[PDB]
Amino acid sequence: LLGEANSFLEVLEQVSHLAPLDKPVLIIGERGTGKELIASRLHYLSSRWQGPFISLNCAALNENLLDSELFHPGRFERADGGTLFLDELATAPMMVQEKLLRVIEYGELERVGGSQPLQVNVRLVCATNADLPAMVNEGTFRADLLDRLAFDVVQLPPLRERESDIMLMAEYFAIQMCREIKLPLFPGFTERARETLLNYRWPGNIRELKNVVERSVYRHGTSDYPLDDIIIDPFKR
Numbered sequence: 001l002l003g004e005a006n007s008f009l010e011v012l013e014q015v016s017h018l019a020p021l022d023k024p025v026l027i028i029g030e031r032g033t034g035k036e037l038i039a040s041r042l043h044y045l046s047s048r049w050q051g052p053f054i055s056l057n058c059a060a061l062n063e064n065l066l067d068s069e070l071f072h073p074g075r076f077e078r079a080d081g082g083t084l085f086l087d088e089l090a091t092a093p094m095m096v097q098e099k100l101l102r103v104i105e106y107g108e109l110e111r112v113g114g115s116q117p118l119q120v121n122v123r124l125v126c127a128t129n130a131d132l133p134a135m136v137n138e139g140t141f142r143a144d145l146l147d148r149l150a151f152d153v154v155q156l157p158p159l160r161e162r163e164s165d166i167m168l169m170a171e172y173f174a175i176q177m178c179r180e181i182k183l184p185l186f187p188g189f190t191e192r193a194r195e196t197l198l199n200y201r202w203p204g205n206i207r208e209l210k211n212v213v214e215r216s217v218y219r220h221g222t223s224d225y226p227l228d229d230i231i232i233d234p235f236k237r
């Protein structure tokens with residue numbers, strides 16, 4: 001994990017204290033900010049580290065199949081003894097959100113008839129970029145679920161608020177790309193390059209930075225001169 005920005009370092013410190021708890025954690029941050037990497041850290045730094053790390057994006061699946069996917073068997077079942085990461089929570093159906101509250105509140109998976117309810121031992125982590133308290137007031141997120149799910153909140157800073165890290169990360173990603181394309185040395189970034197990198201708002205944050213930098217190193221294609229042209233938008237040219 002790259003970064004030295006105070007705001008990022010306070011997140012890592014926080015994660016180190018939260019990881020051993022069995023309490024549910026909410027991660028707030030923009031796309032591409034490393035929320036999944038932090039969730040993975042919460043799992044590997046916990047007592048449950050030898051246990052499974054199951055993950056699921058509540059947008060990587062049809063709305064009507066969330067239920068049965070979550071609770072065919074489900075992610076909870078798979079994460080038993082382990083940890084479950086749920087990205088994109090602010091677009092889960094209310095019923096899944098009320099059922100989610102029940103699994104949190106009661107520690108067991110509801111079973112209709114026949115089978116008795118299934119006891120699970122799962123550390124939960126969720127992630128989003130909504131003002132969840134705003135979705136509660138909007139009738140789009142359950143006030144009761146939030147009152148219990150947000151035991152604590154990890155706020156991951158966007159890249160534009162970790163401005164000291166933009167060049168550190170850009171240089172790392174550029175060097176890795178130089179290795180991929182067999183250039184002998186990364187020749188550096190011009191000041192024009194650095195202005196471009198630092199003045200851009202990075203709506204896709206670290207994912208976007210890596211792709212931008214890699215593309216730019218490739219287009220440049222040489223170690224003879226410093227990299228001047230940062231290609232933010234490949235759809236222009």
Ligand SMILES: Nc1ncnc2c1ncn2[C@@H]1O[C@H](COP(=O)(O)OP(=O)(O)OP(=O)(O)O)[C@@H](O)[C@H]1O
Pocket residue numbers: 001002003029030031032033034035036037038087206207210
């Ligand atoms: N601190 C970091 N150091 C190096 N790479 C990072 C860092 N944080 C994120 N990245 C990289 O950026 C990309 C996105 O990270 P990740 O998927 O964890 O973020 P995310 O917030 O979960 O994104 P999204 O919700 O949009 O899927 C990945 O390539 C990841 O390796």
